[PDB]
């Protein structure tokens, strides 16, 4: 710590021992598909976030 520097926490995200490799949950299936009417379409909306 240094008053005109804030916390310079090293914290490194590196020096952890080899214990846990991440993404340990229920596997999300990447379902591939193709767009064709009326099977797969884009939704007709005005709000942007999807």
């Amino acid at each position: 710590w240094d008053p005109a520097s804030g916390l310079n926490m090293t914290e490194s995200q590196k020096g952890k021992p080899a214990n846990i490799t991440d993404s340990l949950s229920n596997r999300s299936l990447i379902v591939t598909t193709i767009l064709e009417e009326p099977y797969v379409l884009f939704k007709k909306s005005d709000k942007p976030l999807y």
């Binding site: 884009f42 939704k43 007709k44 909306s45 005005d46 709000k47 942007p48 999807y50």
Partner: peptide
């Protein structure tokens, strides 16, 4: 008032 970047504008 509105930012459109989707398929439909109103």
């Amino acid at each position: 008032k509105a930012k459109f970047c989707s398929t439909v504008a109103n």
